[PDB]
């Protein structure tokens, strides 16, 4: 069912994820500490978490077959546009349904709606993010699907600034066909079609979430910017 090339793609993506996601979360101890009582007391800790996560996303992207073959400029636009979406996706691994929080192994490293708001984010923007996480979690995806979706998310031809959209499209299509084939090996029709249609809808949701926060963001006018990291400043503009 899966050709050797499709299997080779998945093997590479699984290994990329395993190298870039540490489920012990030990590195969190080196962040500025979380502070819950200011007023943005969680912003240093959460800014470090985002900065760290951007680095992991870069790591992952560099292992995506053909990504490195793109021009540097196209690699840069793809990552600047996709980074927050991939972080939202990858974060589903820590997300817990019972508490509606991201549980990273300890009470201190367990993040809820109030903690995110203490990082300077609006409740109106956070609610769809939680909703997203719940819906994703309910799909109960295999790790093979999870890493392929992350990859598909990164390599999208329809991101602004992409010069070589055909080449970017050729990579995503190989990833997409691999994903479709994977699902079909796990499920006959029509369940296969329904599950794929759901993943596609989740990518559109992520995109709408990105566009809504960046709309807000681009429509904002130092005290908080000072607390961000150099890499976050660069990536988020």
């Amino acid at each position: 069912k899966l050709s050797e090339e499709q299997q080779h793609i998945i093997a590479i993506l699984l290994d990329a994820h395993h190298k870039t996601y540490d489920p012990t979360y030990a590195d969190f101890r080196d962040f500025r500490p979380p502070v819950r009582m200011s007023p943005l007391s969680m912003l240093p800790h959460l800014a470090d978490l985002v900065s760290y996560s951007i680095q992991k996303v870069i790591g992952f992207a560099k292992m995506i077959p053909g990504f490195r073959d793109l021009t540097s400029d196209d690699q840069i636009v793809l990552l600047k546009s996709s980074a927050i979406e991939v972080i939202m996706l990858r974060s589903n691994q820590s997300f817990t349904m019972d508490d509606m929080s991201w549980d990273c192994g300890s009470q201190d490293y367990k993040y809820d709606v109030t903690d995110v708001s203490k990082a300077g984010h609006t409740l109106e923007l956070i609610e769809p993010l939680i909703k997203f996480q719940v819906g994703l979690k309910k799909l109960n995806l295999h790790e093979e699907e999870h890493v392929l979706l992350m990859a598909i998310c990164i390599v999208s031809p329809d991101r602004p600034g992409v010069q070589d959209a055909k080449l970017v499209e050729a990579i995503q299509d190989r990833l997409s066909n691999t994903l479709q084939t994977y699902i079909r090996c796990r499920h006959p029709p029509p369940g296969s079609h329904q599950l794929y249609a759901k993943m596609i809808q989740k990518l559109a949701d992520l995109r709408s979430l990105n566009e809504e926060h960046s709309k807000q963001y681009r429509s904002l006018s130092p005290e908080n910017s000072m607390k961000l990291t150099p890499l976050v400043l660069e990536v988020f503009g």
């Binding site: 680095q55 870069i58 540097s72 690699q75 840069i76 990552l79 600047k80 150099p230 890499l231 660069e234």
Partner: peptide, 11 residues
């Protein structure tokens, strides 16, 4: 412009 990102991509 995006110097840190460029470096991170080249290494």
């Amino acid at each position: 412009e995006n110097a840190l990102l460029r470096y991170l991509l080249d290494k």
